[PDB]
Design a protein around this ligand. Structure first.
Ligand SMILES: [Cl-]
Ligand SMILES: [Cl-]
Ligand code: NA
Ligand code: NA
Lengths: 82, 156, 157, 81, 84, 159, 155, 80
């Protein structure tokens, strides 16, 4: 139960950290990916713009996973103004 | 062991919620003990570095001026504990309200984003850095870090 | 000798009040499950007596982001004569929250609601918040202490 | 030391409570006074309009004392639009 | 040229009047329709909710036409906060 | 030939509507004298030949440093000799003749209705809050009746 | 008689210009710039100026919270005219208001923080202040200084 | 009547132009100067006004000479 709860909380910290970096310069919204070490573990993050039906909000997903192949532990979608 | 490791995680979640509440609400507002961000050894009587800044406490009822009530908070390490110190008024003569937030924290560190790179000090007194990284080295977990964005704007 | 216990108690009290100011001064006009603006009922949050739940302003988001503010959810309850504060990141949530044990030796949590002419003991209006809320704690040592907080103006349709 | 610290803290709570009551209806801002029981003690509060060097804001002080005669333990000033 | 410009301006006026009515009560956003008399002419308006790919904003279209069957002279899309 | 005069008339009307959009969409929760009112609406107001209206409006936001944030001006509308005229004052509390703009010729009537939450009524005597919506109707000699509906800002004043 | 009417015409011109120049919107417009200032812009006989401006705040529920329009000033046959477009992005003729007669010249200057300058090429921020000067055949030169909203765009 | 109304309008324009320059950098001192407008030299004066800790105030006044009473005085407030 605790191992699981560690992974959830720590992947979630990395998600927030990477969303912050996107939010710094969001007009430049392009796909990227990388690695962040946190609590002794290397996490694999992905930033993905998210198609939109309206002209007012841009959207993007930040996903964090245990390997570059793995399904993500957490995905958070955020919206940015134009 | 399951109980104790479960209690440690819940302690960390509590710490994170509190730190989010503070560091995501940094106020572009100078304070003394003027700087925007105070970051120095033994600040707040920290064992190592201490951080202090003004933050938005709450919006006042709509009739009241000012609309925002600014408080002052700080973080330090005292005997491998992360402590949060809180002041109702940003211009305070001395003792703040102390909260022991997280045990077995060996180090507190703070880095500052200057638009291009992370750096170790912030001596710009008219603008905040665009981002702040708070790094805790826990005795069990090692390094955990949260990045927060600051409000835009300059003072004169 | 236990000048220290009295001081610890005072400091504890101070921490509880900063935390409550932080929550009650930031009530959000946003409905929550399980749909009310303000939940005030027996055994709410599995309180031993009354529990209170509401949405609150968590923080303003950076310039670029929509929405401009993150709304969180908080509750207060009594467990074994201790006041506890419960926190959720999201107002609409599937179960249990982040629990902070806030204050020991609390005999009673009571909340009252100012309807613009007088104080009443429930709030069933799902469209508007009461102009003011009074949170009354009865401590076993200090007795009754109360804090009055104003709410944001506005109604939902 | 703790005795004084208690008084400071509980007088401050009364000040906040009575400020909130002024803020509810501050168009009818008048000099007023009363009593609040808090933590087993009667506190004597006073609301006082304060002159302002402009038309935009009104000010008031809320002051809280141990008796009707005593100097205040706490005085807080607030402004209303 | 002026006859067409008249139609465009007056149908836009009706579109604005009906957007305003939707905005008074936008939690109750639904497909609706009716008629408005303006500048001597009956105009046929329609409000239509627009599917969105996000939870933050609701959208609707207000379209105004010269008959119940006709293609609209004007269509305007607007957005309402889902959690204002 | 005459198609030139019709273009000039539609151009005039477009101009009028832009001005009215600017005013009626920016109505301010600010009482004005003439005993104060939120919305003034009466026969012969401002020397109108029929109905006239007067209200405070948001004129502009002041630069960030400045208090107050919003500069409130005062505007009204009236008919003079079948002309819609717009009258403007820099300050909502004014001793001062207003700045008159001839906005639209051949306007017979000005009529305004106020949405009180359940009906459209013909006067507004609630001094504490604005109506949720206002419908401004003009009767033009050529085009007949045209109307614009505008929503107001939410908020209550104290009594 | 004529002089009072002329004073009143000037008064109206100024109210209008206040309405536009005190509400400059930090939003780029096409042809893309924050402020367009150039010879024969908008078919001016001399200088023309064009910018996005705050039109009105929308009702509470609506997103966006305000509607940005686009306005310009030009001289045509020694008249100051103001042009209005409902949309900052426009395929279009604008709504032309003839504002003031007997205007020989329109000049606009830009405050770069230390001094007034004659052009504005920075497309990420507005100049902190703008000065609009009119030369009238009768009254001569009159000028108005306006402050802009603070803020920067990204490249 | 028209000559007085001219003076009023043109002094008010100079008052507004000088307030704007104060507002550019208000952190606020007594100053004065001359602005040429509509063919006339106008003599302006910026004066801090005492106030609470939240707002600063200044008056801008414009006169026809350095010796004369002002045609117009405008007061404005700035956030501290
Ligand atoms: Cl908080
Ligand atoms: Cl306007
Ligand atoms: Na270690
Ligand atoms: Na007891």
């Amino acid at each position: 139960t605790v191992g699981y709860l560690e992974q959830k909380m720590f992947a979630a910290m990395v998600a927030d950290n990477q969303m912050a970096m996107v939010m710094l310069n969001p007009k430049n919204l392009k796909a990227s990916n990388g690695e962040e070490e946190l609590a002794g573990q290397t996490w694999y993050w992905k930033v993905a713009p998210v198609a939109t039906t309206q002209p007012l909000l841009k959207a993007f997903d930040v996903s964090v996973a245990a390997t570059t192949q793995a399904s993500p532990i957490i995905t958070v979608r955020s919206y940015v103004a134009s | 062991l399951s109980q104790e490791r479960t209690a440690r995680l819940n302690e960390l979640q509590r710490a994170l919620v509190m730190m989010d509440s503070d560091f995501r609400q940094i106020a572009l507002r100078q304070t003394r003990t003027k700087k925007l961000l105070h970051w120095a050894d033994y600040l707040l009587d920290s064992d190592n570095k201490g951080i202090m800044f003004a933050r938005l406490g709450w919006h006042n009822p709509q009739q009241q001026f000012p609309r925002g009530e600014v408080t002052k908070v700080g973080y330090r390490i005292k005997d491998e504990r992360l402590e949060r110190v809180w002041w109702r008024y940003p211009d305070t003569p001395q003792e703040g309200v102390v909260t022991p937030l997280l045990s077995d924290v060996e180090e507190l560190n703070v880095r500052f984003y200057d638009g291009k790179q992370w750096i170790n000090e912030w001596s710009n007194e008219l603008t905040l850095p665009a981002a702040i990284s708070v790094e805790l080295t826990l005795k069990d977990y090692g390094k955990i870090a949260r990045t927060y964005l600051t409000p835009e704007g300059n003072l004169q």
